[PDB]
């Protein structure tokens with residue numbers, strides 16, 4: 020890779036000046052070893068004080084391996100980097116990926132280190148390995164090549180990648196390959212046995228046409244991804260409390276579905292009755308409940324993905340290891356809902372479960388739409404920002420905001 | 434001539450679009466002009482500056498200043514303008530080490546590097562921007578024009594470029610001498626080691642040996658300053674550390690700037706003096722910005738100050754860090770949203786102390802504050818020691834498990850153990866998850882007229898108990914809370930309450946144990962006294978009996 024691609028920031032925007040956050044000694048030592056080798060390989064270089072920019076860095080362990088990986092938080096640089104139309108006006112997101120029976124995710128970020136970064140842009144990739152307790156000046160570097168996690172790296176590399184994939188694509192016309200940041204998503208409908216080998220067939224391709232983590236494979240089955248429609252209880256005896264909760268749920272659902280009615284069911288709650296008193300359903304209330312049940316079977320109307328708007332992901336803690344979430348662009352027009360349980364690690368660690376939920380939801384968002392949602396997280400900012408990097412295992416990072424007032428609607432997805 | 438390596442130049446630029454400075458040189462007295470010509474002649478002989486021609490269009494004013502018992506004139510180049518137009522730099526000297534993160538060193542030498550400073554050349558392409566002019570006597574000849582060849586004192590980039598140039602020069606020496614530590618800040622180079630003093634004095638020599646290869650002359654820091662080192666407000670002693678003496682001024686009249694300075698000192702002091710409190714004192718400077726405004730001290734601020742004075746009577750000291758021992762952090766609740774903590778490795782030998790104050794807010798509870806304190810100490814400990822300490826917290830393991838499993842947010846506290854030191858943090862009420870059999874059911878509601886501010890609040894129950902209370906100067910939200918309060922007041926130890934108030938649910942589901950709203954506080958006091966409370970929400974105006982009835986009773 021000889022010629023660099025001219026890269027620039029957006030009009031009237033300077034480079035990132037983001038504070039490095041404190042790192043544990045073990046992550047510093049890991050980054051020191053990593054960056055020493057990258058510097059020997061020419062991928063990064065020491066910079067002097069005339070470079071004022073900075074992007075935070077930390078270290079992670081990808082899912083199911085013991086070697087530290089450097090992770091740069093390029094979120095600020097990414098949003099300040101010019102919008103990219105690599106060689107064409109845009110690679111249409113493949114609507115077919117979300118339908119494949121199996122999708123495997125490959126870390127191909129290491130391929131980026133073979134392309135030089137435009138020399139005029141390098142200063143904007145500055146980062147700091149901090150010392151403990153400010154005992155020594157942080158170690159200052161910038162990238163000489165396409166960095167993992169930067170928006171422009173897949174863009175600039177897209178020409179080189181399409182060529183590597185051509186012979187494989189030419190041979191397997193029904194396999195769907197989609198590239199998002201440092202990752203490749205490879206979906207087939209065939210047996211996992213041949214799927215796997217077929218996956219390895221594609222690794223060798225990148226191995227002959229060229230990795231510390233290329234051996235790994237994150238396996239997904241989006242054809243088995245299950246949604247969460249709105250369900251109403253089926254009971255033989257309703258207490259006053261049961262009906263109160265039902266009318267509340269139906270009233271909330273009426274903002275989503277037209278023609279939900281609660282008149283007949285509210286009729287049952289005539290008088291000032293004890294909450295535990297059993298109320299027989301009339302025939303009018305049962306019909307109304309049946310008509311509501313029917314309405315709720317059908318999907319929401321006029322829900323369409325608008326590629327110009329952000330995706331918003333809300334998450335609720337339901338307790339006992341269970342989490343519900345909804346993805347939408349306008350309120351009450353959910354594009355996707357879901358529910359998780361028994362998060363791999365952390366039967367006793369809420370924040371680790373939430374971090375894993377965020378990663379799984381972001382992965383679903385990439386498959387379905389090719390971009391990451393903005394999260395509304397049920398957690399105090401200070402708790403989240405102290406701990407999430409300890410459980411992070413993806414090479415991208417979405418945006419997030421914090422919910423400080425308890426939503427009343429948690430109980431509706433319950 | 435022993436060849437010396439050149440110090441690599443740092444390339445420098447002005448901010449984009451901006452040009453160099455063009456500030457007129459003031460008039461100077463004949464005496465000052467003579468003085469400046471002598472100084473600059475010497476500086477030119479030493480290579481620091483050079484005469485330039487008239488084509489250079491830039492200029493920075495120069496001044497002459499006199500001192501008390503140094504009857505010298507001293508030079509002064511006012512680079513204020515040039516700094517405004519100079520690019521930003523990486524300033525590598527933001528934070529300083531905290532003493533509690535340092536390890537003991539048998540021997541410490543301090544070298545002077547103010548002289549090596551001038552060996553750092555200034556980027557050639559940038560020198561033109563540093564031009565200045567000595568006016569001539571009687572303005573009868575052209576002013577003498579000079580520019581800098583070295584980092585000018587007072588120029589924006591000199592600290593960072595100098596610090597960076599030294600670090601680079603030192604890099605190989607530090608890496609090939611893992612048994613010493615080197616710290617630089619300003620014109621001082623601090624070298625420490627656990628070697629015997631003789632064998633340490635030799636490392637020092639080798640360092641001079643190393644430094645000279647860039648032609649850097651560096652002798653001991655003149656009048657080597659007996660322990661402790663007065664550094665960044667600390668007293669670094671060989672075996673202990675503290676803040677420099679903290680003396681709280683005695684006064685009858687306390688003013689805005691006094692209380693600011695008083696909190697400054699107390700905050701500085703709280704990193705080693707345990708149990709410092711600053712809420713009531715900090716309280717008194719809520720919004721005033723006239724530092725001359727006098728403020729009376731609440732009797733709760735005098736008691737707090739007198740409490741601080743007692744803690745300041747005898748000096749306290751911290752110990753240095755031992756990486757082979759555990760790191761432990763212990764927190765106490767002090768009241769009024771205040772928290773204090775100690776970090777130590779052995780009991781009774783604090784590395785440092787600290788405090789935490791609750792965030793501004795209408796409603797809050799002790800467990801949420803304790804969690805915030807834990808996060809603050811975690812992050813401070815990562816900074817200072819590169820690791821999380823083990824926590825000792827005044828909360829029962831069972832309390833915490835009940836809190837986090839039932840709290841609507843994700844929450845986490847790292848490895849910790851209970852320490853039975855009152856007051857203990859506890860949960861003060863827990864709402865039922867299901868309606869209570871045999872408990873009376875209160876349907877509550879309230880409403881207020883937006884124009885007149887007249888309201889009503891009350892309830893109707895399944896046993897026919899009823900109450901409506903007329904209210905003045907109220908609001909919908911207040912009447913909704915008042916209604917729940919009335920139901921709590923008038924019910925037995927177990928009660929089911931039905932409200933349509935999304936506002937009230939939002940407060941109560943946050944599980945406050947204390948509020949700035951007297952009304953919420955009164956509700957909390959009632960919840961504490963109950964044995965069981967189930968709170969149910971229903972949507973307003975849906976014909977939900979009981980709710981409908983009481984909505985009518987209160988909507989006048």
Ligand SMILES: Cc1cc(C#N)cc(C)c1Oc1nc(NC2CCN(Cc3ccc(S(N)(=O)=O)cc3)CC2)nc2ccsc12
Nearest residue numbers: 154530535536537538540541614616623662664669670671
């Ligand atoms: C060397 C140094 C000096 C100062 C000052 N002002 C500040 C910093 C941050 C320094 O930098 C480092 N200091 C240390 N530890 C400390 C431990 C405590 N003492 C005080 C002392 C010791 C011995 C004598 S004595 N008996 O020689 O008179 C007198 C005073 C100083 C060194 N560790 C590191 C690790 C990386 S940098 C660095």
Ligand SMILES: [Mg+2]
Nearest residue numbers: 878879973984
């Ligand atoms: Mg009402």
Ligand code: NA
Nearest residue numbers: 861946947961
């Ligand atoms: Na209390």
